[PDB]
Design a protein around this motif. Structure first.
Motif, PDB file in Angstrom:
ATOM      1  N   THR A   1      -0.842   3.717 -14.771  1.00 17.45           N
ATOM      2  CA  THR A   1      -0.390   3.234 -13.479  1.00 17.45           C
ATOM      3  C   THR A   1      -0.580   4.309 -12.412  1.00 17.45           C
ATOM      4  OG1 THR A   1       1.491   2.316 -12.260  1.00 17.45           O
ATOM      5  CG2 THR A   1       1.959   3.981 -13.942  1.00 17.45           C
ATOM      6  N   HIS A   2      -0.719   3.859 -11.169  1.00 19.54           N
ATOM      7  CA  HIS A   2      -0.965   4.746 -10.040  1.00 19.54           C
ATOM      8  C   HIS A   2       0.141   4.572  -9.012  1.00 19.54           C
ATOM      9  CE1 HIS A   2      -4.457   6.938  -7.819  1.00 19.54           C
ATOM     10  NE2 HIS A   2      -3.285   7.417  -7.444  1.00 19.54           N
ATOM     11  N   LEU A   3       0.693   5.689  -8.548  1.00 20.89           N
ATOM     12  CA  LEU A   3       1.709   5.698  -7.506  1.00 20.89           C
ATOM     13  C   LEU A   3       1.118   6.244  -6.215  1.00 20.89           C
ATOM     14  CD1 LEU A   3       4.639   5.163  -6.732  1.00 20.89           C
ATOM     15  CD2 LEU A   3       5.161   7.521  -7.374  1.00 20.89           C
ATOM     16  N   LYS A   4       1.468   5.613  -5.098  1.00 15.47           N
ATOM     17  CA  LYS A   4       0.971   6.001  -3.787  1.00 15.47           C
ATOM     18  C   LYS A   4       2.131   6.046  -2.801  1.00 15.47           C
ATOM     19  CE  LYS A   4      -3.732   4.163  -4.284  1.00 15.47           C
ATOM     20  NZ  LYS A   4      -3.530   4.433  -5.735  1.00 15.47           N
ATOM     21  N   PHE A   5       1.880   6.669  -1.651  1.00 20.61           N
ATOM     22  CA  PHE A   5       2.861   6.738  -0.580  1.00 20.61           C
ATOM     23  C   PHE A   5       2.138   6.669   0.756  1.00 20.61           C
ATOM     24  CE2 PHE A   5       5.442   8.806  -3.935  1.00 20.61           C
ATOM     25  CZ  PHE A   5       6.550   7.986  -3.870  1.00 20.61           C
ATOM     26  N   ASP A   6       2.912   6.431   1.813  1.00 21.75           N
ATOM     27  CA  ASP A   6       2.395   6.425   3.175  1.00 21.75           C
ATOM     28  C   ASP A   6       2.884   7.618   3.986  1.00 21.75           C
ATOM     29  OD1 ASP A   6       0.914   4.093   2.800  1.00 21.75           O
ATOM     30  OD2 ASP A   6       2.596   2.801   3.357  1.00 21.75           O
TER      31      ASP A   6
ATOM     32  N   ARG B   1      -1.102  -1.749   5.554  1.00 24.30           N
ATOM     33  CA  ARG B   1      -0.684  -0.359   5.404  1.00 24.30           C
ATOM     34  C   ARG B   1      -0.051   0.203   6.672  1.00 24.30           C
ATOM     35  NH1 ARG B   1      -5.562   0.155   1.461  1.00 24.30           N
ATOM     36  NH2 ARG B   1      -4.438   0.601  -0.488  1.00 24.30           N
TER      37      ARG B   1
ATOM     38  N   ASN C   1      12.376  -3.301 -13.060  1.00 25.72           N
ATOM     39  CA  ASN C   1      11.978  -4.429 -12.233  1.00 25.72           C
ATOM     40  C   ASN C   1      11.255  -3.926 -10.992  1.00 25.72           C
ATOM     41  OD1 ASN C   1      13.019  -7.570 -12.451  1.00 25.72           O
ATOM     42  ND2 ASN C   1      14.098  -6.198 -13.864  1.00 25.72           N
TER      43      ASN C   1
ATOM     44  N   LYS D   1       6.312  -2.430  -2.237  1.00 23.82           N
ATOM     45  CA  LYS D   1       7.704  -2.737  -1.935  1.00 23.82           C
ATOM     46  C   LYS D   1       8.168  -1.810  -0.820  1.00 23.82           C
ATOM     47  CE  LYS D   1      11.102  -1.429  -4.183  1.00 23.82           C
ATOM     48  NZ  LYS D   1      11.596  -0.933  -5.497  1.00 23.82           N
TER      49      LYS D   1
ATOM     50  N   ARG E   1       6.803  13.095  -2.569  1.00 21.24           N
ATOM     51  CA  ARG E   1       5.950  12.026  -2.061  1.00 21.24           C
ATOM     52  C   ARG E   1       4.615  12.600  -1.614  1.00 21.24           C
ATOM     53  NH1 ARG E   1       9.749   9.929   2.249  1.00 21.24           N
ATOM     54  NH2 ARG E   1      11.747   9.556   1.186  1.00 21.24           N
TER      55      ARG E   1
ATOM     56  N   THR F   1      11.757   0.170   0.656  1.00 17.86           N
ATOM     57  CA  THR F   1      13.139   0.543   0.390  1.00 17.86           C
ATOM     58  C   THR F   1      13.553   1.659   1.334  1.00 17.86           C
ATOM     59  OG1 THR F   1      12.998  -0.091  -1.945  1.00 17.86           O
ATOM     60  CG2 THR F   1      14.774   1.404  -1.308  1.00 17.86           C
ATOM     61  N   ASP F   2      14.659   1.445   2.039  1.00 13.21           N
ATOM     62  CA  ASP F   2      15.252   2.431   2.942  1.00 13.21           C
ATOM     63  C   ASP F   2      14.240   2.901   3.986  1.00 13.21           C
ATOM     64  OD1 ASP F   2      17.776   2.304   1.753  1.00 13.21           O
ATOM     65  OD2 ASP F   2      17.264   3.844   0.274  1.00 13.21           O
TER      66      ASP F   2
ATOM     67  N   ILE G   1      11.101   3.218   3.665  1.00 12.65           N
ATOM     68  CA  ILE G   1       9.922   3.856   3.083  1.00 12.65           C
ATOM     69  C   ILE G   1       9.174   2.848   2.219  1.00 12.65           C
ATOM     70  CG2 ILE G   1       9.174   5.505   1.342  1.00 12.65           C
ATOM     71  CD1 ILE G   1       9.477   6.723   4.063  1.00 12.65           C
ATOM     72  N   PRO G   2       7.873   2.671   2.422  1.00 11.93           N
ATOM     73  CA  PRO G   2       7.092   1.781   1.564  1.00 11.93           C
ATOM     74  C   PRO G   2       6.492   2.513   0.369  1.00 11.93           C
ATOM     75  CG  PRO G   2       5.778   2.425   3.457  1.00 11.93           C
ATOM     76  CD  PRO G   2       7.065   3.226   3.524  1.00 11.93           C
ATOM     77  N   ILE G   3       6.311   1.758  -0.711  1.00  6.35           N
ATOM     78  CA  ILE G   3       5.789   2.286  -1.964  1.00  6.35           C
ATOM     79  C   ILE G   3       4.689   1.365  -2.479  1.00  6.35           C
ATOM     80  CG2 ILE G   3       7.936   3.480  -2.528  1.00  6.35           C
ATOM     81  CD1 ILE G   3       8.503   1.227  -4.546  1.00  6.35           C
ATOM     82  N   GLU G   4       3.587   1.972  -2.921  1.00  3.12           N
ATOM     83  CA  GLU G   4       2.410   1.302  -3.457  1.00  3.12           C
ATOM     84  C   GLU G   4       2.333   1.579  -4.952  1.00  3.12           C
ATOM     85  OE1 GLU G   4       1.695   0.028   0.327  1.00  3.12           O
ATOM     86  OE2 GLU G   4       1.297  -0.809  -1.661  1.00  3.12           O
ATOM     87  N   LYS G   5       1.824   0.617  -5.722  1.00  6.62           N
ATOM     88  CA  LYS G   5       1.545   0.858  -7.131  1.00  6.62           C
ATOM     89  C   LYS G   5       0.365   0.015  -7.596  1.00  6.62           C
ATOM     90  CE  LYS G   5       4.844   2.054  -9.778  1.00  6.62           C
ATOM     91  NZ  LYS G   5       4.136   3.327  -9.476  1.00  6.62           N
TER      92      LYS G   5
ATOM     93  N   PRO H   1      12.415   7.085  -2.277  1.00  5.96           N
ATOM     94  CA  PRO H   1      12.082   7.129  -3.704  1.00  5.96           C
ATOM     95  C   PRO H   1      11.583   8.500  -4.133  1.00  5.96           C
ATOM     96  CG  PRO H   1      10.328   6.075  -2.496  1.00  5.96           C
ATOM     97  CD  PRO H   1      11.430   6.310  -1.503  1.00  5.96           C
TER      98      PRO H   1
END
Lengths: 122, 5, 115, 119, 56, 229
Positions: A75-80, C103, C45, C66, A64, C68-69, C71-75, A101
């Motif tokens: 596509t772009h993936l991000k996290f906090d 955020r 999905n 979204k 992460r 999950t558990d 933890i947030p996820i951005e796309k 994830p």
RNA sequence: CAAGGAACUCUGCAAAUUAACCCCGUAAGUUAGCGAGAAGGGGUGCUUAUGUAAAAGUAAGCCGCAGUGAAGAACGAGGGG
RNA sequence: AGCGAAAUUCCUAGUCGGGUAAAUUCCGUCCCGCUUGAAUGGUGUAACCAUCUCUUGACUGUCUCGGCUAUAGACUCGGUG
RNA sequence: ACCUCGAUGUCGACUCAUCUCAUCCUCGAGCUGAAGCAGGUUCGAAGGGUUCGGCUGUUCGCCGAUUAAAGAGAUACGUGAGUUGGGUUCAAACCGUCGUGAGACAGGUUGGUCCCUAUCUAUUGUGCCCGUAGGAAGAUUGAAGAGUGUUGCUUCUAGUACGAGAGGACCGAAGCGAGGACACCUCUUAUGCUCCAGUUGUAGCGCCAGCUGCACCGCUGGGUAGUAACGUGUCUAUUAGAUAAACGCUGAAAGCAUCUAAGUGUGAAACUAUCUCAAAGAUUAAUCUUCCCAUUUCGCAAGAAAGUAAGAGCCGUCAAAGACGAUGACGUUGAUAGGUUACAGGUGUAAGCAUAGUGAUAUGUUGAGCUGAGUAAUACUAAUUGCUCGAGGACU
């Protein structure tokens, strides 16, 4: 993004909670570890019970990154937050369970166990 | 400056 | 010579899909992506909520989030993109075209649906 | 260096354009520099082309620039603008103000210019 | 820092060799007996045709 | 090499999708037809080259020498003239389009004048490093760095020639090679090439055969939109 | 001013939070005075009702990501000479 | 007596332990204290220090690493110089 | 003790480096106490690179982790008229020692001012003038040059050659990386002070409402164009010629032998070009093309008073340019700037009204209003019915 002297959380539970980067592999002066970049790390904050203590140095894979990265597809993936998993020396991680994830890019690096014990891959 | 010693 | 800068849109009309609905800033949507581990295609999905919507053409892109558990996820999703299915599930009301306060908000981090 | 004058800022220029457009609406001929006339021309034309609607919405929106003058205060100059300036210019699209160049000034030899309207 | 050896008249003259003023273009107004500038209006107030400024 | 060249104007750059789920950046060039003006033969001028023209403009405002040359050579009155070295196999008074010089996805190279920047600093020009910002900086804290080659006449007392120094940036013709061509438009007369192209919109753009891999192709297919209403 | 957060560097030098009011809770040590605003938290906008002279307090309702919404208010802890 | 590699210590980066991933700094003990030491005072000391030094939580362009905006200069022009 | 005291500013750190090779790596070869991987040694080779941190002011040194390595030196032990002051070291004071004393200590400590607006030279840019036996416009070639040249990981070849078992290839091919560089704003962000929306205090537009000024753009959340990286594209090759180390064939001298004397070769990030950029001020002033000129003609016979009609310049509106100047597009036969219209993007439901609500307020009119640069049309405004230079091609 992810570089030298960075503290981050631990996505799996081998005993450690906070982990600091010590150097980044690749050529000299890497200065930036991406998703899947093996990194030498040290343990800073850890629960007492487990198979690790405070002081040891291990190798880790980042799963992460808050900044993220623009994937080849588009596509772009991000996290906090920032999460890492620990390995002994081989691609097989020591962890018993991986929380949260994991990025799909790791498919291009091996580490099939990371895909195999993930709750859901993004 | 000064004091070249 | 002479131009109109509509050629930017002219070389554009070869790659649009006309089935995308309208959804501005705060709606609950779903998106599916085709993943190719092999000639067997898998349909991912991806539920989430609208975060931003901005563009001038194929550059029109939106953001899906979204959780999950814990933890947030951005796309980031390109509106005009093959193997991308876009659907609308819930519509809400927000006063900002792009919302940035989300955020740092989880837990009762939801939008009242439109009336 | 340090504390020396604030000089020209956004506030100062917005005043200069507002006050100059108020003055030219009051009288119709302004002596300034060429590059300040160019700066105030955009606001002048925008205001005078927005003047021709004659309703309270634009009457409100135009208040953002106008300001009183030595011969008429804010309200009378406002009423005048739509009384005889706005209803006079409607069949010609934009471009109502012109700038003409003078000789150099005596003191600082800077470029002086006349800004005026045109029937 | 300062100059080491005095700059004679030669140095200053070769330095000012390109400082001369160039003439400004002039034109004659159609109803004004004056030698006014180019694209400008003189003291009588005509750019030609349209009037604009006071007599004086 | 048997290089093939053509001219156009950069009108804007936009991205288009392809197969294998890949995102590509593409620049769009308006390809007004070029007209050959001369063939520099190996027998007369001792170097093979081809001189072309483009950007036709009304004849009246065009100058006298160029007008006379075009009248005598029976060509389209144009505004820009330029030649390409080592291009042969074309007769005088011929039509040139990018759809009989290139393939669908063969490698090319693109050249154009770099966009200007004004008088820039040293650090921004040669990618130097800004010095310290705390613990004392002096009246300069952003500058060239040491230009010393030594002190005394034994090794020094002249500044080395052509050392990286502050000055003009840009407005100089640069080139980036090994670019894949993607889109042809003979109906709207446009070329869409991958990567990014130096030079601001509205300038001259030259597309030539890449000097690295001449006549090397790779197939690229434009992606299709399946999900329809 | 992205992410990292002292890796800078002679040393956290400089720079960033904390400020006002009100309401909770506060050690080791001591000459028992203090330490102490210790540390660490919560509320502050608008309207209505109740409440006193006004506030304060409470409740109900409303909006904004944000409410001493701006402007002025102490970074802290541990160890040593 | 007391204290003790202390502002005193040459060998010295003395040994060991704590602290760090990794410590000529810091803390605690060991004392062939070259030259500790008792009113030129010795030891401990609660509170305080625009004193010095060490560790640490938040914290940030100090830094990995540079960029933009606004001005006032610097730059062109007019007057003095 | 030779130059300096009528001043030559002394360590280290920072930025920027440049040079030599006695090579730290990548590269080629020989020998081997080289089975193969991994080595040892020697030769040839300077194109590139040659790490980040803790301690100490530190070079050095020790340590930790990486990588291909963490090279040896020099340049007034590179560089304070480019920075710092951590120290020797200025005046203060202290601990220990010496001194019967003021005081001193290669004994150590706490605190302690770094001046200078650029003349010449040299350099990076950018110009004016002049020149090439006519002028102008272009397009060219290339004399001498500058920059770019660093490599790792995994897989196939193949667990094959090798070894016995452990172990394990050279030679090539494919895919993905780090560092540096050239660019470019489609996506992602940063900035974006005449943009949008919300928002506190306060003084005004007489009060409601709505606006204006101020409080770091007043603050907050976004954000046009432009400029940027953390973002994306490519460059890091391939091969030719002549070579070092070395490797050879044939061949005698010296009937053998021998890589050399003749001849004919193999042979590397080195060398010339193959890549990129500029270039005829290359005065040795180069090539080609098109366009322009023709008013007798005298005095100290010089081609002289008329000096384009080709073009350029003066001046003007501008930016794809830009410190100024230049460069580039256009100057009424025009789309260069300004305005207007239309459109894109951003913002998010303008104001008013109507209704619900005792009131903060909520719904419809409404995805409405607004907008510096954005895209294009449009003579409405701006660029005048202006001025200057500028030709007779010298002789053979």
């Amino acid at each position: 993004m992810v570089s030298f002297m960075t503290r981050l959380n631990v996505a799996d539970n081998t005993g450690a909670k906070q982990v600091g980067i010590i150097k980044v592999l690749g050529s000299t002066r890497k200065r930036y570890a991406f998703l899947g970049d093996v990194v030498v790390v040290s343990v800073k904050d850890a629960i007492p019970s487990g198979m690790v203590k405070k002081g040891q140095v291990l190798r880790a894979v980042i799963v992460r990154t808050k900044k993220g990265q623009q994937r080849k597809d588009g596509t772009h993936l991000k996290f906090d937050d920032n999460a890492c998993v620990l390995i002994k020396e081989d691609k097989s991680p020591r962890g018993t369970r991986i929380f949260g994830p994991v990025a799909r890019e790791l498919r291009e690096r091996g580490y099939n166990k990371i895909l195999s014990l993930a709750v859901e891959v993004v | 400056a000064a004091t070249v010693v | 010579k002479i131009n109109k800068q509509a050629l930017i849109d002219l070389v554009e009309q070869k790659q649009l899909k006309a089935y995308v609905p309208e959804f501005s800033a705060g709606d609950e949507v779903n998106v599916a992506i085709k993943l190719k581990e092999k000639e067997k295609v898998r349909i991912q999905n991806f539920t989430g909520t609208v975060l931003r919507r901005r563009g001038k053409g194929i550059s029109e892109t939106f953001i899906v989030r979204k959780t999950t558990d814990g933890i947030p996820i951005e796309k980031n999703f390109q509106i005009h993109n093959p193997n991308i299915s876009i659907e609308l599930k819930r519509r809400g009301k927000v006063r900002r075209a792009y919302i940035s306060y989300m955020r740092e908000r989880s837990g009762k981090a939801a939008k009242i649906k439109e009336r | 260096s340090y504390i020396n004058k604030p000089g020209k800022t956004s506030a100062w220029r917005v005043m200069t354009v507002r006050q100059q457009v108020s003055a030219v609406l009051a009288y119709g001929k302004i002596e300034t520099t060429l590059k300040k006339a160019k700066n105030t021309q955009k606001r002048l034309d925008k205001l005078i082309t927005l003047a021709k609607v004659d309703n309270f919405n634009n009457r409100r929106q135009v208040k953002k620039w106008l300001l009183n003058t030595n011969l008429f205060d804010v309200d009378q100059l406002m009423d005048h603008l739509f009384s005889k300036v706005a209803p006079k210019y409607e069949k010609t699209p934009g471009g109502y103000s012109r700038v003409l160049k003078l000789g150099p000034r005596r003191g600082d030899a800077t470029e002086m210019a006349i800004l005026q309207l045109t029937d | 820092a300062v100059q080491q050896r005095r700059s004679s008249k030669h140095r200053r003259d070769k330095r000012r060799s390109h400082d001369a003023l160039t003439a400004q273009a002039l034109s004659v107004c159609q109803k004004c007996g004056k030698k006014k500038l180019f694209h400008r209006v003189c003291s009588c107030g005509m750019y030609g045709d349209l009037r604009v400024k006071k007599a004086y | 090499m048997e290089i093939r060249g053509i001219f156009g104007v950069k009108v804007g750059m936009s991205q288009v999708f392809t197969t294998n789920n890949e995102r590509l950046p593409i620049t769009v060039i308006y390809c007004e037809p070029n007209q050959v003006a001369g063939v520099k033969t190996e027998a007369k001028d001792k170097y093979s080259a081809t001189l072309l023209s483009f950007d036709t403009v009304e004849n009246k405002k065009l100058n006298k020498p160029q007008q006379g040359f075009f009248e005598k050579n029976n060509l389209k009155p144009t505004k820009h003239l330029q030649e390409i070295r080592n291009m042969t196999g074309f007769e005088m008074g011929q039509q040139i389009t990018p759809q009989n010089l290139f393939q669908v996805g063969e490698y090319v190279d693109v050249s154009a004048i770099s966009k200007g920047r004004g008088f820039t600093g040293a650090i921004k020009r040669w990618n130097f490093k800004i010095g310290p910002l705390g613990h004392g900086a002096g009246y300069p804290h952003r500058f060239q760095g040491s230009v010393q080659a030594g002190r005394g006449g034994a090794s020094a007392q002249r500044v080395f020639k052509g050392k990286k120094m502050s000055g003009h940036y840009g407005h100089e013709k640069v080139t980036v090679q090994n670019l894949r061509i993607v889109g042809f438009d003979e109906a709207n007369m446009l070329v869409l090439v991958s990567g990014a192209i130096a030079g601001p919109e509205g300038g001259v753009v030259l597309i030539r055969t890449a000097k690295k891999k001449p006549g090397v192709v790779k197939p690229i297919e434009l992606a299709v939109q399946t999900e329809k209403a």
